[PDB]
Amino acid sequence: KLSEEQQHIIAILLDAHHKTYDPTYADFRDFRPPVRMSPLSMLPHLADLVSYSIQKVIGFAKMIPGFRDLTSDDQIVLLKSSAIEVIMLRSNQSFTMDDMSWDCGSQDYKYDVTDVSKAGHTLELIEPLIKFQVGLKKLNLHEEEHVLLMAICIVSPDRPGVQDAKLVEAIQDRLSNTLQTYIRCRHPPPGSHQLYAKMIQKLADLRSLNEEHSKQYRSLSFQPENSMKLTPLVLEVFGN
Amino acid sequence: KNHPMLMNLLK
Ligand SMILES: CCC(O)(CC)COc1ccc([Si](C)(C)c2ccc(OC[C@@H](O)CCC(=O)O)c(C)c2)cc1C
Numbered sequence: 362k363l364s365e366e367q368q369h370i371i372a373i374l375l376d377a378h379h380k381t382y383d384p385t386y387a388d389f390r391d392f393r394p395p396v397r398m399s400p401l402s403m404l405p406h407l408a409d410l411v412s413y414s415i416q417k418v419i420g421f422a423k424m425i426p427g428f429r430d431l432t433s434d435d436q437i438v439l440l441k442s443s444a445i446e447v448i449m450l451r452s453n454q455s456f457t458m459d460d461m462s463w464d465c466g467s468q469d470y471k472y473d474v475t476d477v478s479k480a481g482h483t484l485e486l487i488e489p490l491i492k493f494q495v496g497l498k499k500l501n502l503h504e505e506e507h508v509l510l511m512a513i514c515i516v517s518p519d520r521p522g523v524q525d526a527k528l529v530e531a532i533q534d535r536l537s538n539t540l541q542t543y544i545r546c547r548h549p550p551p552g553s554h555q556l557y558a559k560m561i562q563k564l565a566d567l568r569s570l571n572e573e574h575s576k577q578y579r580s581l582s583f584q585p586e587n588s589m590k591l592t593p594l595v596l597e598v599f600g601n
Numbered sequence: 602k603n604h605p606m607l608m609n610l611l612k
Contacts, residue, residue, distance in 0.1 A: 433608065437604055593606060594606050594607075597604050597606050597607060598607060601602050601603075
């Protein structure tokens with residue numbers, strides 16, 4: 362019982378994802394190369410990767426139905442607070458549970474816990490990050506549910522600094538109703554409710570992952586020798 | 602507290 366508006370929304374989000382996610386990872390060749398050999402040897406490569414993904418998340422967010430009906434300040438607030446979470450979400454497409462790594466094409470662009478360690482982060486973040494990727498992968502989401510979850514995570518009225526929270530909620534409500542209805546067409550109860558509840562829990566997990574990444578990013582970026590290796594976009598989005 | 606790069610990408 363997907364309405365034609367709900368079918369329209371899913372078609373829009375699927376296309377937006379296909380225009381902002383490159384499964385070939387061809388643009389990785391333009392990043393500063395990874396050094397693995399202590400110095401934060403993977404910070405330059407991973408900073409470029411994160412910077413590249415921030416751009417993709419902005420491109421995806423712009424195509425969410427209703428997002429551009431918000432003020433520019435609310436668009437900025439929603440993107441600044443959600444960029445880290447959407448990166449963790451969209452990274453799950455490359456995550457594989459064979460060796461707990463993000464496989465993006467080749468061994469050069471295959472990242473494990475030690476590579477994240479090589480960017481300055483500790484297990485306080487990486488251990489919660491890995492169990493998130495595993496639990497998300499075990500859901501075996503359809504691409505429809507995946508792109509809906511990313512959009513819902515962006516248009517969240519539960520963000521500090523939001524001005525028109527009621528408008529943000531109304532936009533999220535139709536994405537949420539679209540996701541709930543899509544699940545019901547593919548899963549009878551109670552499995553239908555067990556899936557949507559686990560997806561909302563993943564959004565809750567991202568909030569604590571958001572908090573821990575910002576704590577470690579603040580300690581890392583406070584050192585000028587580290588922030589020198591970042592990009593201007595990362596400094597703007599992750600800093601102010 | 603100003604985001605000229607995000608604004609440019611949002612435009
Ligand atoms: C620089 C700031 C720091 O904190 C250092 C100060 C480091 O931050 C880091 C470091 C590592 C990770 Si990650 C979860 C191992 C990861 C994996 C894969 C991936 O690829 C996305 C690809 O899916 C996009 C493809 C496309 O859109 O075409 C991305 C983006 C991230 C995340 C963060 C936030």
